Design a protein around this nucleic acid. Structure first.
Ligand SMILES: [K+]
Ligand SMILES: [Mg+2]
Ligand SMILES: [Mg+2]
Ligand SMILES: [Mg+2]
Ligand SMILES: [Mg+2]
Ligand SMILES: [Mg+2]
Ligand SMILES: [Mg+2]
Ligand SMILES: [Mg+2]
Ligand SMILES: [Mg+2]
Ligand SMILES: [Mg+2]
Ligand SMILES: [Mg+2]
Ligand SMILES: [Mg+2]
Ligand SMILES: [Mg+2]
Ligand SMILES: [Mg+2]
Ligand SMILES: [Zn+2]
Lengths: 76, 56, 47, 133
RNA sequence: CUGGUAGUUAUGGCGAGAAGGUCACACCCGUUCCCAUCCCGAACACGGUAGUUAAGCUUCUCUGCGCCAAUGGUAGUUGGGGGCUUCCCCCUGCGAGAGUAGGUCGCUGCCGGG
RNA sequence: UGGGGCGGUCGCCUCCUAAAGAGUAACGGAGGCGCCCAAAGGUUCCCUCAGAAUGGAUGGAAAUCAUUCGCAGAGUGUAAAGGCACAAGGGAGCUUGACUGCGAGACUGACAAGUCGAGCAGGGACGAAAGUCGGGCUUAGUGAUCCGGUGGUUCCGCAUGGAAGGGCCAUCGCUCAACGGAUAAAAGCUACCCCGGGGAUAACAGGCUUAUCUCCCCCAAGAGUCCACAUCGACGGGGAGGUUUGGCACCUCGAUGUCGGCUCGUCGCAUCCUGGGGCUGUAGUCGGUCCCAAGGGUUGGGCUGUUCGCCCAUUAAAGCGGCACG
RNA sequence: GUCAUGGAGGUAGAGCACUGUUUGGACUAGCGAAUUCAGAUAAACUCCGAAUGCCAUGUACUUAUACUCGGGAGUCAGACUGCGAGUGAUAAGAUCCGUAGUCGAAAGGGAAACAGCCCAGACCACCAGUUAAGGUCCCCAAAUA
């Protein structure tokens, strides 16, 4: 008797790192993802592995673009 | 204003209810507080209404 | 694939490491890269 | 009754909470067997019930089976300890929730229909009742 | 009234039926020139305007499809309490999906010409 | 490590389990990696897939051509998931940013490590500008220190000038795969065995469980010379018991003696004989089956350590189980 | 802690729009692939989608911690009960996670006795009172209500 299974990968800790309505400082990571599950908005950049980050100081807002999609912005 | 009396014990109860009873100012059983009638205090009373007696 | 070192043709400094396929590229690769010593772009050649 | 192929060979056992999602009404024939409780029903039980109720009617009328054994279950032999992976598949089962109609018949009078359904219900591990459209 | 250019979860789309005009727009005519075709002046580019609303375009009418969508009920469920525990029941608060009444053949902004 | 051994596994990536933040175990359920690409990288410009119907020589269901329908039913180097038709998919032109010094601030995290990053300077590629470019749609494709090799260097250099030798920067040498890597270097037997410990962990018996097992039933197709139910009863279904084969590891390792027999028994009843009865495929004789019933009774030898079993000869009969297999 | 407000997130349920599994007709390229009609099913299906839990904001009301630096530790065998899962047989006082409680380290009252269930936290003394779970014919305090 043997299983021939038993392997897994380490969890990567994805999801939202800041809250809607929270004040954030420049360069902070807002969201971690595979693909553009959420798009970059105003004053928000997209990293090389799809990480969304703030480019200025301000307050975070999760918003809804056209019907099927979402984005996040930072407003001073 | 309304009067609040702790009738049941806290042994065997979950932590959120103990924290709510603490924030109401109540200590040992049969102890009494008098408070105002805000929606905040009403929400507290709703969370622990099975442990407490309320009198207007 | 193999590991490659690229040498500056005006200083002899070995500034860069890269890779290539030896069957597809049997020659010596040449690329124009920045040279930190001369602070300008110079042709670099595989050693 | 066995599925031709499956995507996976092993599966969780599941649960049987709540009333049946769909199939609680007679939809093709005039008469039906309805489950009053929940139970796993294997394909041997389905086959035995079907043969009994079909033989009583002498191949007259029509019979519809409204449940399929999609799920598989496994087992371990005698003498093996716990561990070392999951066991080997044995049979196929249908989980039936309360309120599900599992057999329907048409094309025969009251007496033949009711007696055939009574004969069939004695082959099943669940508590049943007879309903008319 | 029309041409350009924006915003807004298709209530804005698809489909069907018609009217209109070289003022704008377009089809259309041609390839000397700049430029172009793995071939083709079809497209792209350039040079003009005989004919035209046939089409695009603009305007009006349709619920056929699509899309939007209540109310009540039901499933599920936080907290409290019970059974005869494959599971089930009661009290309080929250409350779908499906189905339906119904809505929809768009609505706002700036500029140049009639 | 559901005792140990045998077998399997040991690092990294993706999904489910995982209970709508993150995290989350099992010798749980499924698959990949130890690379590849000089373009399959950068930029500028351009455009759009699978399949089907119809019409046509070789040509055929499917090869090339033409029209229509066609939101992606294709593709995306490779596993999966999340993404992508303002392409991240497909073509063409020019190229080497698959740059050097860095880096406000964040994510992850015991540490060691790992991940994202606007922006600044140097010098560039492509574009008319705007601008994009510090590899590849994203996430695997890797190994510390010590010790050595190679290139560079306005560093040191044991009286002084040198040299030998070191330091610093760049790079190379691991299936160190038991993948945080004990050493540069390593396999077996012990029934001749010994010490320290453990009921943290197996072998006997106890406990829990009841798949299996023994017994009892439900439905009734059939058998029974006609005839379901005298006697049996397939395919399926439901229980009781705790004597079998198992599962678990709860008491006992500063000791709970382990098979068979002998001696001495005692209890249960699911009754082997004897007592009472109903049905019969009960004419009689001889039987079958079920209900009541535990008062008493229930053999001597051959073979085998045997329990069991087969045989010989009897008997009214030669019961089955529990009591630490009394 | 509650209240108000704003968000991220795909479980329960449901559904069939994709992917697998699947039943009965009509029609059928040729007993039988496709199209349609009706009806099912899913841990690794999703056109949908809660309750809870989580992250923030507030000037709202209440309440008492939170953090940083330094000295000294012990712990790395856990158990049962309820709820949500895996393994097992939808067995085990079994095993392995998540969530809350009690024991551990907790005496007192009730479950006959009975770590882990129900009620409830012992500073000391009293020949005082009121209650909880559980009870009120006798043992045995209280209704032969
Ligand atoms: K039945
Ligand atoms: Mg590419
Ligand atoms: Mg070594
Ligand atoms: Mg020997
Ligand atoms: Mg034994
Ligand atoms: Mg035992
Ligand atoms: Mg001892
Ligand atoms: Mg003998
Ligand atoms: Mg005799
Ligand atoms: Mg015995
Ligand atoms: Mg201890
Ligand atoms: Mg103790
Ligand atoms: Mg006690
Ligand atoms: Mg009375
Ligand atoms: Zn140089």
């Amino acid at each position: 008797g043997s299983t021939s299974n038993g392997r897994d990968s380490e969890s990567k800790r994805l999801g939202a790192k800041r809250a809607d309505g929270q004040f954030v400082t420049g360069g902070s990571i807002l969201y971690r993802q595979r693909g553009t599950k959420i798009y970059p908005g105003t004053n928000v950049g997209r990293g090389g592995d799809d990480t969304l980050f703030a480019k200025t100081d301000g307050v975070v807002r999760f918003e809804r673009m056209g019907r099927d999609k979402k984005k996040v912005s930072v407003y001073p | 204003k309304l009067e609040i009396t702790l009738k049941r014990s806290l042994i065997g109860r979950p932590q959120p209810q103990r924290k709510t009873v603490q924030a109401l100012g109540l200590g040992k059983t049969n102890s009494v507080v008098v408070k105002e009638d805000n929606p905040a205090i009403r929400g507290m009373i709703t969370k622990v209404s099975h442990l407490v007696d309320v009198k207007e | 694939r193999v590991n490659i070192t690229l040498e500056c043709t005006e200083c002899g400094d070995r500034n860069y490491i890269t890779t290539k396929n030896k069957r597809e590229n049997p020659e010596r690769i040449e690329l124009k890269k920045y040279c930190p010593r001369l602070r300008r772009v110079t042709l670099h050649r595989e050693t | 009754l066995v599925p031709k192929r499956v995507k996976y060979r092993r599966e969780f056992r599941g649960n049987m909470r709540g009333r049946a999602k769909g199939g609680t009404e007679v939809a093709f024939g005039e008469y039906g067997l309805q489950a009053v409780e929940a139970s796993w029903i294997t394909n041997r039980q389905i086959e035995a019930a079907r043969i009994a109720m079909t033989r009583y009617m002498k191949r007259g009328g029509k019979v519809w089976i409204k449940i399929f054994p999609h799920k598989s279950y496994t087992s371990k032999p005698i003498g093996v300890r716990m561990g070392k992976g999951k066991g080997a598949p044995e049979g196929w089962v249908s989980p039936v929730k309360r309120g599900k109609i599992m057999f329907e018949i048409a094309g025969v009078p009251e007496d033949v229909a009711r007696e055939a359904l009574r004969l069939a219900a004695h082959k099943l591990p669940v508590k049943t009742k007879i309903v008319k459209r």
